[PDB]
Symmetry: C2
Subunit: 216 residues, 2 copies
Amino acid sequence: ADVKLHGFWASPFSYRVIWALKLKGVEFEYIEEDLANKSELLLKYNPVYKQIPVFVHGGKPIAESLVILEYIEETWPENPLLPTDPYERAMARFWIQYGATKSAAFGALFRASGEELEKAAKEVVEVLRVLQEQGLGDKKFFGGDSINLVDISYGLFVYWLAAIEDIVGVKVLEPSTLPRLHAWAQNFIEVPLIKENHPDNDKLLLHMKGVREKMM
Amino acid sequence: ADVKLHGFWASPFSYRVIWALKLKGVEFEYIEEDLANKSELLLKYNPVYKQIPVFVHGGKPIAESLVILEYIEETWPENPLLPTDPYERAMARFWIQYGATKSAAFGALFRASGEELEKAAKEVVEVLRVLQEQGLGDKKFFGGDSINLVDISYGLFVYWLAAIEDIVGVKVLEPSTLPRLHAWAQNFIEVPLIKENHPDNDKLLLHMKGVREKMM
Ligand SMILES: N[C@@H](CCC(=O)N[C@@H](CSO)C(=O)NCC(=O)O)C(=O)O
Ligand SMILES: N[C@@H](CCC(=O)N[C@@H](CSO)C(=O)NCC(=O)O)C(=O)O
């Protein structure tokens, strides 16, 4: 396979690329990186950040999941994951950037000690409320009737929410508080592409529990 | 004028939009916002962040300078500010995102107290070295022989460097340490479009000095 993807089994960032490639029907070779012993190709291809994912097409590398997603959308334009209208595309990019900026609040809640856990959860709920009210609205998905790059970027929120609930013991996405966003999260998880491509849940929660245990 | 731009006289973010519009030859109405008494249109158009710039086209608003820049490039494709090849476009977006991520180091250096000022300056120099070596290379501009959206995004670095040097008293862009990036910064400042469109330097340094004086 011409296309290569360097990833990590538990990474939402490399899963974003797997979803986009599988949606487009692009064959690819997947390379699992040991983050404690990074491959020579990983360090050569991504000297700036030394992170996965690293997507390679025709021997040329691309780092940063959002940048890779836009390259895939431009290179394989069939089965579009962005709208064609520039204004609608700007709204999609606006919400993808909002997700990237606000993703730090989820890590803060995940590592928050007993005190200030209530405050960290409060800030996450507000982020989700704005996302629901101004981003999603009454649509089934951020992409309308089917998922698009906005829904793919928000898989990271679902990953964080499910882990925070099962490990931290706090639920920041309550059906009675955010009915539309909660319905979205359930619908997203049930999309066959998503159902078929995600880290083993038991293995993922165990891994994340050990990561949280480090920060005391 | 159909196109409207809500900005702030001392903002590099609204200057990014002015540069792109003037390069494209798009007429626009400029609205100066008082950040202490935001207009009804500013709060209506940008409820998520309540910030300038806010670009309006056909009565429809767009917030976030990088998102607005891509909308302008797609809407007025003549005089291109991004390459057409998807791989080259991905490298442009990669370096624009690197600039956004690393811009926080400049604010850190600007507000750094006497102790840890040396450390903040060290981290900025490393950011600039990677930008020079891996981003700019031997090109005159990030856009090659003429400025593109990458150069426009890096006007923010020039704004910070000039202010840090004249206010903090530390020079993080030395010609003998970063010759290519220093030559780039001088060439960028001398582009007639840039020379003709920037905050009054005396007025800007005075304003920024007062902003730094607040954080003690
Ligand atoms: N902005 C990037 C983030 C990638 C990332 O965090 N990758 C992590 C593992 S995923 O939890 C990574 O590769 N870290 C390297 C390390 O742990 O040393 C993107 O969106 O592609
Ligand atoms: N991510 C945005 C940043 C805009 C911004 O910081 N704007 C500031 C003033 S510029 O120094 C702003 O509008 N702040 C509002 C306030 O001070 O309340 C962009 O790139 O458009």
